Amino acid sequence: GIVNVPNPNNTKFQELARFAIQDYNKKQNAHLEFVENLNVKEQVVAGIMYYITLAATDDAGKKKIYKAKIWVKEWEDFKKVVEFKLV
């Protein structure tokens, strides 16, 4: 079950999306820039599974909506981007 996070562009979430954009830019040799999260949803798995929908600029500063699915286990300070794409 995926459920809505009520404060999705908070502190913690903007840092979860900035980490995925940095995972992405390093692995793709790309230059996306996070602007803002638009929505966050979550599923309980072996930890939590976050479906974040966000805006990033592509260098030309052109805005695009992306979606990252990141697996995180708080307790073992584990962050892992399972997917990243355009919506």
Structure token digits, residue 24 = 């992405």
Q: For residue 60, count other CB atoms closer than 10 A to its CB.
A: 7
**Domain edges within the chain:** 1-87
Task: In whole angstroms, give the CA distance from residue 2 to residue 8.
Answer: 14
Task: Please report which residue ranges of 1-87 form alpha helices under DSSP H.
Answer: 11-28
3-class SS of residue 85: strand
Task: In whole angstroms, give the CA distance from residue 52 to residue 69.
Answer: 7
CATH code for residues 1-87: 3.10.450.10
Method: X-ray
Q: What is the resolution of this structure in A?
A: 2.5
Q: For residue 86, count other CB atoms closer than 10 A to its CB.
A: 8
φ/ψ of 7, rounded to 5, equals -125, 70
Structure token digits, residue 35 = 């602007």
User: Are 72 and 48 within 8 A, CB to CB?
Assistant: yes
User: For residue 46, what are the contacts with CB-CB under 8 A and spacing of at least 6?
Assistant: 73
